[PDB]
Design an enzyme around this catalytic site. Structure first.
Site, PDB file in Angstrom:
ATOM      1  N   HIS A 230       0.846  -1.223   0.000  1.00 35.80           N
ATOM      2  CA  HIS A 230       0.000   0.000   0.000  1.00 35.80           C
ATOM      3  C   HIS A 230       0.867   1.253   0.000  1.00 35.80           C
ATOM      4  CE1 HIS A 230      -3.239   2.842   1.241  1.00 35.80           C
ATOM      5  NE2 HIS A 230      -3.876   2.052   0.345  1.00 35.80           N
TER       6      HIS A 230
ATOM      7  N   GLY B  10      -1.189   5.266  10.928  1.00 37.75           N
ATOM      8  CA  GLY B  10       0.288   5.236  10.985  1.00 37.75           C
ATOM      9  C   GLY B  10       0.877   3.889  11.423  1.00 37.75           C
TER      10      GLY B  10
ATOM     11  N   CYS C  59       0.257   0.935  10.121  1.00 37.03           N
ATOM     12  CA  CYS C  59       0.440   0.059   8.942  1.00 37.03           C
ATOM     13  C   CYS C  59       1.869  -0.496   8.906  1.00 37.03           C
ATOM     14  CB  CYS C  59       0.132   0.908   7.706  1.00 37.03           C
ATOM     15  SG  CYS C  59      -0.395  -0.105   6.327  1.00 37.03           S
TER      16      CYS C  59
HETATM   17  C1  LIG Z   1      -1.886   0.730   5.776  1.00 37.18           C
HETATM   18  O1  LIG Z   1      -2.218   1.775   6.289  1.00 37.18           O
HETATM   19  C2  LIG Z   1      -2.666   0.140   4.704  1.00 37.18           C
HETATM   20  C3  LIG Z   1      -2.345  -1.093   4.176  1.00 37.18           C
HETATM   21  C4  LIG Z   1      -3.136  -1.643   3.173  1.00 37.18           C
HETATM   22  C5  LIG Z   1      -4.244  -0.980   2.694  1.00 37.18           C
HETATM   23  C6  LIG Z   1      -4.539   0.271   3.266  1.00 37.18           C
HETATM   24  C7  LIG Z   1      -5.493   1.194   3.086  1.00 37.18           C
HETATM   25  I1  LIG Z   1      -7.124   1.159   1.669  1.00 37.18           I
HETATM   26  N1  LIG Z   1      -5.354   2.235   3.877  1.00 37.18           N
HETATM   27  N2  LIG Z   1      -4.231   2.026   4.671  1.00 37.18           N
HETATM   28  C8  LIG Z   1      -3.748   0.821   4.267  1.00 37.18           C
END
Ligand SMILES: *C(=O)c1cccc2c(I)n[nH]c12
Ligand SMILES: *C(=O)c1cccc2c(I)n[nH]c12
Ligand SMILES: [Cl-]
Ligand SMILES: [Cl-]
Lengths: 295, 295
Positions: free
Chosen positions: A41, A137, A139
């Site tokens: 992403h 944040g 992710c």
């Molecule tokens: C991380 O923030 C992440 C990972 C994968 C997909 C998405 C999306 I749509 N928004 N944030 C993501």
């Protein structure tokens, strides 16, 4: 004595966490040997093969604390990006990429901008979500178990679903559950209670002197499983009865006698009593978790 | 979204943990600059000044992983031994020794033989015990908070009391509560519920969309405090109302309106409902914990 939701010591993972930026998108990556792993992403309907072919190495900013790592190669594996860097992480622990099963636990190191914030234990739910604690944040934050000195990475965080539960991938970028790394109508399916874990936790309570819920009664696997189904508990198997053996032995309580206790708790509730400080039947401790923490 | 009992990332503390042996007694120590801190019990009615004057530097084996540290000085500070070593710990973080208040939370790094096993959050109870998770060998395990890069050490583990709860000292070896580092009839006093924390956690639930327990009603500090006393809750103060200000503001719920909700929950119970996944009123999250984790 005592029984807590205990995470693995996070040090070995903290030394691997980095920040990855592409455009104005920043998130967390995992730096092992000379590769950085992060959610693809970071390069955002999308067609990721199209999006990635339009990038170069210089489009990826990787920051390990202050030190900028030079990206010398990039490739996609399923929903994870692999950024090859010109420096092996000197803090790389012994590690493995393992996928876990529904009902298994792991530690989450929640991270923001490459900086670790907090560590907590999670179970993989039967519906392949996790009831995490994650803000914008986070992710790229990873989930792991540690055996001896070896870190088994099992989860990389991607998504929050509309019920506030979380969805992600294993470290080869394969999602847990029927989820995709884009905006859709996707939602968590119906969930169930992890029966073997609830019995493990009742064993923990006994080892720790909570014995109020025990009874002189027994049941068969099949009569237990008929009450299980009624209260949205998953079926108990002989394998499950076998893995509860060591806790049965340590406590002198037959697994099927503990099942009779659980049937009574499900039929009658707790009458304002607690077990190990909870007023509900806890299902996020595995048999291994109980053995690890009790004695 | 989500709300978990989250510990601080433990890395900074793991790099300080060592094993200390005197005679056939082994336990954990904390290695900061050129000093190792551990429970003075490691040299065991006892008269510790008598016991210590009979020791030499060579009677203390300190092991940091494999490396044996040479002890070049020893002294007692209250219930802690300070072993001066010939090498400064190169992994010493920025640190402080702080004593915490009843109702405050900290992370525990549970350690065995100098090796970290697990990390969990604890509150200091009003009765100056902690509901920890500790097995034989955990003596010397430390409790801490982290602000930016600075580790505030607040607890060193000593004792298990007869209710299975835990007693220890601050890092200058002063016990929390009326406890001693020897075998006596000592027992935990009566405990109370930490009211400000329960209200903080109800705020967390609102921030996370659990709003079922709210009501249109209000109360005064004094009528709240009269119901508090009845259910073994500690009194709420204006300072407490002030520290709940930012959570009040973020949610638009007056502190005294949240108190009216808590009075109803105490009078009526939960009618088989949950809040943030609990069936009882949780009191081990501070206002700071909620703000740290929510948004
Ligand atoms: C991380 O923030 C992440 C990972 C994968 C997909 C998405 C999306 I749509 N928004 N944030 C993501
Ligand atoms: C650690 O194990 C420790 C610390 C202080 C006092 C005691 C006793 I009596 N047994 N173990 C102790
Ligand atoms: Cl490896
Ligand atoms: Cl310092």
């Amino acid at each position: 004595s005592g029984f807590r939701k205990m995470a693995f010591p996070s040090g070995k993972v903290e030394g691997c966490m980095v920040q990855v930026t592409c455009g104005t998108t920043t998130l967390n990556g995992l730096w092992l040997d000379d590769v950085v792993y992060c959610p693809r992403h970071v390069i955002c309907n999308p067609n990721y093969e199209d999006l990635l072919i339009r990038k170069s190495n210089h489009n990826f900013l990787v920051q390990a604390g202050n030190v900028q790592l030079r990206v010398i190669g990039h490739s996609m594996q399923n929903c994870v990006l692999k950024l090859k860097v010109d420096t092996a992480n000197p803090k790389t622990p012994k590690y493995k990429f393992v996928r876990i099963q529904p009902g298994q636990t792991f530690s989450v190191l929640a991270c923001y901008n490459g900086s670790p914030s907090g560590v907590y234990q999670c179970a993989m739910r039967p519906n392949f979500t996790i009831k995490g604690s994650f803000l914008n944040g986070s992710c790229g934050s990873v989930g792991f178990n540690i055996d001896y000195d070896c870190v088994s990475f099992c989860y990389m965080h991607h998504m929050e679903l509309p019920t506030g539960v979380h969805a992600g991938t294993d470290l080869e970028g394969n999602f847990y559950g029927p989820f995709v790394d884009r905006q859709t109508a996707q939602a968590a399916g119906t969930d169930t209670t992890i029966t073997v874990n609830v019995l493990a936790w009742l064993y923990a309570a006994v080892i720790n002197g909570d014995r109020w819920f025990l009874n002189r009664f027994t049941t068969t696997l099949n009569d237990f499983n008929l009450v299980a189904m009624k209260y949205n508990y998953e079926p108990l198997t002989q394998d499950h009865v076998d893995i509860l053996g060591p806790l049965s032995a340590q406590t002198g309580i037959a697994v099927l006698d503990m099942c009779a206790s659980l049937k009574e708790l499900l039929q009658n509730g707790m009458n304002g009593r607690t077990i190990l400080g909870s007023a509900l039947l806890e299902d996020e401790f595995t048999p291994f978790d109980v053995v690890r923490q009790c004695s």
